[PDB]
């Protein structure tokens, strides 16, 4: 897929909001575990996300959780639009199953979160890895 698009939402999970952020045409993913869902939180992690890679357009399955204007002032500063064009709901699934298999590694969700995250990104699947397959990608767009 188009390499600047990334999928952005959040699930629940022990009382607690996970947000997940997924690059669609690799399957790479980057989390935090966040105090609420708020305008703030997601304008935060949206202008961290595009200080790192470049982010052109995001999607998102809920809609509503871009309207505040905490949002949209963070996408007008980074340049980002809202992409309106199986992969997330594979790499979403693939992310709970591994929190839950390494939750009792860690005390706090938040590390059993980054634990997975990490197991996720490095799964060599052939037959590269979702980080391999990234900065190939990235590195490929951006000669030319």
């Given at each position: ?5 990334w ?8 009382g607690?909001?996970i947000?997940?952020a ?6 790479y993913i ?9 305008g ?8 961290k996300?595009a ?12 809609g ?18 809202q992409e309106?064009?199986?992969?997330i ?29 990490f197991?996720h ?16 990608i ?7």
């Open positions: 897929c188009s390499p600047g698009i999928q952005l939402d959040c699930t629940h999970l022990e607690k909001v947000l997940v997924v690059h669609v045409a690799s399957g980057e989390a935090e575990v966040i105090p609420a869902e708020t703030q939180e997601t304008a935060y992690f949206l202008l996300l200080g790192r890679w470049p982010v052109k357009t995001v999607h998102t399955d809920n509503s959780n871009f309207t505040s204007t905490t949002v949209k002032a963070a996408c007008w500063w980074a340049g980002i639009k309106f064009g199986a992969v709901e594979s790499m979403n699934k693939e992310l709970k199953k591994i929190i839950g298999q390494v939750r009792d590694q860690a005390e706090h969700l938040k590390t059993a979160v980054q634990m997975a995250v197991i990104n490095k799964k060599r699947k052939g037959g590269y890895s979702a980080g391999e397959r990234i900065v190939d990235i590195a490929t767009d951006i000669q030319t």
